[PDB]
Amino acid sequence: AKLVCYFTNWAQYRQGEARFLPKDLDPSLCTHLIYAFAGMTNHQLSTTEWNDETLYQEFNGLKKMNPKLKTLLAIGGWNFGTQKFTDMVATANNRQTFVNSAIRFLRKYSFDGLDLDWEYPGSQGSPAVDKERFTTLVQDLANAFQQEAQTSGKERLLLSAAVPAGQTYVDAGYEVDKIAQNLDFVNLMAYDFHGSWEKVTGHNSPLYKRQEESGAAASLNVDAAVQQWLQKGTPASKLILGMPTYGRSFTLASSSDTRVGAPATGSGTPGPFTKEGGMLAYYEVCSWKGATKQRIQDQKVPYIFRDNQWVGFDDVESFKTKVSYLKQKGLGGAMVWALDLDDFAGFSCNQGRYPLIQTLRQELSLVPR
């Protein structure tokens, strides 16, 4: 089993207890640690924060304490957009520039692989031609990593990708059966299914549909997303089930209707640490004073409300349920977005350090002996 965990290079800017610093990294918590994010400059892999090189040293330095640990560098992310990917994959020349830069960069900074997080080929401004060009990019990287291993005698660089759960994005961008052959593993982003972009409440990461749902909505759940990727050709052993250590929040139209599917007027109030309306870290909801926690019986996940605020999130029990699910489906492990959104310092939830991610590690039978 794998436990793949994302580090984010902006968590260092949060205030107080929520500030995530190198000391908060645990070398033995996860099997694979992925650094979010690198960017691109003139079609070449590049840093995005002023101190990334410092953090790379610490991050990859964890391997001295746990030599089994593998690290990867993720390129892209939502905020990165699509244009630089589009421009880079447009020509064989530009792809080669990128691929060669990536090998050099990963070797220089002591990463074990690259995670592709283009959001997304064929959508978010990216043209339809990018579906096949993404397939080509994945193959170009896989083949170049293979060649570099042969020539250098070094253990081959890993290639993974973070991929969407919804059919619209999947079919616009992803030749699943082709790319899965060339990726070492596939990080399924089985979250962000619902959120404050919708005008009714819905859960960030429900396991199954609700009885009331129909049409496309009936596939906006973890089980449907997993089955989608499997049926379209991903080997189960390569599919890694993403898990969110955050929730998505709404302002309710009325404090009297707190159901799933109740009318919402917009994003929930920003959290005191994460300061982004519409999401909250686990540590911002786990100890929510004067709130009422409930459960979506069909979907196997909790929500919580207080006055006109409503949040769908994941707890220890829902993580257990999801690990049982992934094991039943024979998947390759779990992935988690993100280290810094769990109660990494144990300051809020009275559950110790990393209560959610330790649940994953336990349930996957990955606790160090």
Curated annotation (Swiss-Prot):
Disulfide bridge partners, by residue number: C5-C30, C286-C349
Catalytic reaction list: Random endo-hydrolysis of N-acetyl-beta-D-glucosaminide (1->4)-beta-linkages in chitin and chitodextrins
Which residues does the record list as glycosylated?
A: N79
Query: What GO molecular-function term can you cite, just one?
Result: chitin binding
Record-annotated GH18 domain positions: 1-366
Which residues does chitin bind?
Answer: E49, W50, G76, G77, W78, N79, Y120, M189, A190, Y191, D192, W337
Give GO cellular component annotations, separated by semicolons: extracellular region; extracellular space; lysosome; specific granule lumen; tertiary granule lumen
Transmembrane region(s): none
Task: Name the residues annotated as catalytic in the UniProt entry.
Answer: E119 (proton donor)
Q: Where, by tissue, is this protein expressed?
A: Detected in spleen. Secreted by cultured macrophages.
Q: Where in the cell is it found?
A: Secreted; Lysosome
Which keywords are on file for this protein?
Carbohydrate metabolism, Chitin degradation, Chitin-binding, Disulfide bond, Glycoprotein, Glycosidase, Hydrolase, Lysosome, Polysaccharide degradation, Secreted, Signal
Q: Per the UniProt record, which EC number(s) apply here?
A: 3.2.1.14
Q: Name one GO biological process term.
A: polysaccharide catabolic process
Q: What else is known?
A: Very high plasma levels of CHIT1 are found in patients with Gaucher disease type 1 (GD I). Can be used as diagnostic aid and to evaluate the success of treatment that brings levels back to normal.
Family membership: Belongs to the glycosyl hydrolase 18 family. Chitinase class II subfamily.
Provide the assembly information.
Monomer.
Q: What does this protein do?
A: Degrades chitin, chitotriose and chitobiose. May participate in the defense against nematodes and other pathogens. Isoform 3 has no enzymatic activity.
The protein depicted here goes by the name: Chitotriosidase-1
Which organism is this protein's natural source? Homo sapiens
Lineage, top ranks:
Eukaryota, Metazoa, Chordata, Craniata, Vertebrata
Q: Which residues of the full protein are shown?
A: 22 to 387 of 466
